[PDB]
Scaffold this active site. Structure first.
Site, short mmCIF file in Angstrom:
data_model
loop_
_atom_site.label_atom_id
_atom_site.label_comp_id
_atom_site.label_asym_id
_atom_site.label_seq_id
_atom_site.Cartn_x
_atom_site.Cartn_y
_atom_site.Cartn_z
N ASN C 53 -2.27 -10.88 -0.77
CA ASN C 53 -2.05 -11.00 0.67
C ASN C 53 -1.64 -12.43 1.02
O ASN C 53 -2.30 -13.13 1.79
CB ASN C 53 -3.29 -10.57 1.45
CG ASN C 53 -3.69 -9.13 1.17
OD1 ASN C 53 -4.74 -8.87 0.60
ND2 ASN C 53 -2.84 -8.19 1.58
N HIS C 118 -13.08 1.69 -5.57
CA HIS C 118 -12.83 0.68 -6.59
C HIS C 118 -12.78 -0.72 -6.00
O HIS C 118 -12.67 -1.69 -6.76
CB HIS C 118 -11.53 0.94 -7.37
CG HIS C 118 -11.44 0.20 -8.67
ND1 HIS C 118 -12.42 0.29 -9.63
CD2 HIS C 118 -10.50 -0.63 -9.16
CE1 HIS C 118 -12.09 -0.46 -10.67
NE2 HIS C 118 -10.92 -1.03 -10.41
#
Lengths: 148, 148, 148, 148, 148, 148, 148, 148, 148
Positions: C53, C118
């Site tokens: 990001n 996850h």
């Protein structure tokens, strides 16, 4: 092919693996692949089981013993310790795992998380303790438990 | 796409990163940026892999080894260890992670989420165990495990 | 503003504060009230940021370094280390902490906790690791971790 | 009745408990009992408080100091240190504890209810850290934070 | 009915179990089975209990002492320590556990978990502390806490 | 992500492949195999870009320069040239390739599929001429045009 | 999980069983039992595999070799034969079953269900043929085929 | 928990009670108290069981013998005698009691619910007979029969 | 909860108040503020309680004694007197109040005022008697009577 058989199968492979690692290394010229065989001639084991629900635990322990003998294991080379409840399994395992002769210890028990109120607290402790115990003492510790 | 290729790449970068900090500092009069180059000549690695879903796991290991050699690694300096199950990975990484030669290790496995209570406790312990081991030995561990 | 603004402020108050705690014991007339000043000169700092990001982390680091100089911080006394993934932040941070020069560490991190499977496991262990180091190493750290 | 007064009361008698415990062994000829008294003369304490929500925290800190003087404590033997947030209470607490003269520590704080995501990750860690410090330092610390 | 009885019975036999497991070795052809036994001559104990809800706990303390003496115990070799909280037991148990003339520790208390404040957090924390101490010091500890 | 990333990587692979074929054969008594490593040290490259739509192109070309340095390339050994439009790409590339220093060539451009009747002609022409030069000169020429 | 594992295990058991019956009888003067262990040391094996469905047959054959070597088998005690057709195994199997050295034979193949009437006759004949060889020649065979 | 275990526990401590009672008189200078301990070493017991309903009675008799050995009893000092019906339990019980070496007696049986008329006449008499024997023989006997 | 605690705390500090008020004089410019204090060394007490409803009162008597000893009191300097009624306390308290070695008196009892007979009258009378005795003899008296 009960779950006790699975625990024995896991235990036997590690006792061979750690021997290979501690042993002399390969000659090189390619990737050094390390593997654990299934032979059981000259390996000593230990087992811990709980008294609670002896009707559903006796089957598990008996099935585990058949795995070692079939794969070439002498009945004389097994040690069995019985403890009051599931909460006491980790502390008992430590004493066995610290002996020089023993090469692996198996854990067998039954859990009542949800079967009885206010048991999740105890349920998490046993799983956490056994794994954390293994790292410090440098030794495989197979894990096996049932949910009621 | 395959996690095997991705996990290995991360291991390569941090190996160079640590080597920089342990050496001399950067140029003065500026904020010394630090970044890891993607070269892999001269390093040494290790891998631990499970066996559940034997069909799927074989692909992952092939990707990891390809990335290491492709970026200039020597096949003579990789060691592989295979373990029976997911619960067993943390102890295996211990033996490798504390050898004076290895520089980083990679763990490959498959986890099952919500299938049965037995596997649920396994997932929590494997995640916690791997992280703590790295912080205590000052070497990187890559958590390349698929789920479901 | 951004969380980097608030995150930086907390670290500034800490490094000097620990200096006072190890100060002279020539007191006792009345109760002591130790407190941290806001001076920045002569205080080294360390900063670690992830890479995933990128569109977000760029502003956080940009929006955080300004506050350090704004209190009289010299850019020559700041070190930055970029890392690939959030899950592997704590291991890198420990290496910088052990350096006798740096006196504070801050971390930028974007997490998607509670978004998809996850990632909850990753989102959980990240906080626990950083807290443990602070007590062990005895140097403050700031939990500058944000989420979508 | 407030947590400030109640939290302090735990501190006074444990300081007495440990002093008697390490003074002599079993008396013999009868069952041995160890108990702590509510006497504060001759003891020195330490207190840690949070900056945020200064309104509520002002009353709690005032209450705690009232108890010490009421039971026979000298105000010259109390040390107060402030911190900007809850996250840094554990690290600060260890600093005071390692000081040899201090005999006990007290913690005060206020926790907000779900202003932003993943607060529990930060919220839970402070409680865990305090317990860990107590065992290894071998010195009591009280827990007196209040939810919002 | 008296949970002090249930907790006491577990503690007595575990001491016997350790007495034999770490005792003199033995040689034989058949499998070795190690089992606990209810026999409390020559065993040194120690009890810790909280004041919280003093109406009920005082009953349980008496029950534990009755079990030891009836099963062959000696009142001269029992040490008792009292503390003011459930959060505050683990630190107290640590000092008792390290005595070279103590074989087991029994901990009993009350938890009122539910809608009450501060109780969801501390309830978990107290359980973890006791478990870790047992493995660290290699000595059994029993958990006899009851809740409404 | 950035398509320049893909185009850049392919350049290194092909460069090493031809670098090996000129040499001697591999080990006998097996199947000869030739593969291109990703090491990018000591290699000269060239890049060509179109000025139209400088917004997208600028990001795209920047996404390519980082690759060579990151994989171990010397930042002062890649040449850059720009052309008025797509039609001029082939002739510009031809000029560079004939040099006795450059070992690979990369082309970058942005196009819209059949926006106008003349746009259809150039699309066929640009690809057709580019491929022919590669075969004639015996030197790799990567393709990096973007459609729509 | 694969049929290759299951077929191999049966061969291991049967080889030991026949070696026991052909040997001298046991003592005890009570009811007498026979059973086959799972130790593969010193035994010689052979395998015959088809070729249809290139993807799958190789996977099954790989598993069979793993089982023998893991349980103590020697790599250079296995003989392999490959044939094109599923209708064609029995003739090949006979040529190998009559060698003195061989002690067991494993058959691996794939059959098609309901595709054409032509294969229907194929499926019936192959099964009964292999059975007749075992009885006629007095040597165990295994039937490791799959369909659909 | 079953009547077999519970019934036995009464036996062990009365054997201790009578031994202390006839050993000395009032100590003097304080209130005198006489109490029985749960210690079985050095004591010999006797047990009577009924033939009918061998299914249920088998478990109860097994439970009683378990308690004696667990608390420190030697299996060589236990005498068991069987009878075909409940009616003859009293007459048989007197035979064992008159033996000088025995120190206590235990009774086990099962009663059916109204199979035939005037069962109560037979059913009630056994209970009455046991009480009468105890007073005149001056030796405890336990009552452990269970209704159907 | 224990009203004996509440009554006891009031009595302790009033004795301190009188200790200072009638003590040595002092000279100063600022206002003089005289305040109580919880410190019970060198203070002689005396307790009076009734049998009425002996189930509950016995609990309260223990609570009062606990407060004195915990706050620094001495068991050697506590005198207890028991009477059979609530109407019948004031006469008993008179004799204790006149002892030259008594500093305070604590009175606890039970009132069941309501529809019961004789209780509306005596309930008022007992209160007035205690108040008048305090002023007459110049010594504090506490009122810890509870009612349903």
């Amino acid at each position: 092919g009960n779950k006790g058989w699975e625990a024995a199968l896991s235990a036997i492979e590690m006792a061979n693996l750690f021997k290979s690692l501690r042993g002399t290394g390969g000659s090189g010229s390619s990737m050094e692949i390390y593997e654990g065989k299934l032979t059981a001639e000259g390996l000593r084991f230990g087992i811990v089981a709980s008294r609670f629900n002896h009707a559903l635990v006796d089957r598990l322990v008996e099935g585990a013993i058949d795995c070692i003998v079939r794969h070439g294991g002498r009945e004389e080379d097994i040690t069995l310790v019985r403890v009051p409840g599931s909460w006491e399994i980790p502390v008992a395992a430590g004493e066995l795992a610290r002996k020089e002769d023993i090469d692996a210890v198996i854990a067998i028990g039954v859990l009542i998380r949800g079967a009885t109120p206010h048991f999740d607290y105890i349920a998490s402790e046993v799983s956490k303790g056994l794994a954390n115990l293994s790292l410090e003492l440098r030794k495989p510790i197979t894990f096996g438990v049932i949910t009621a």
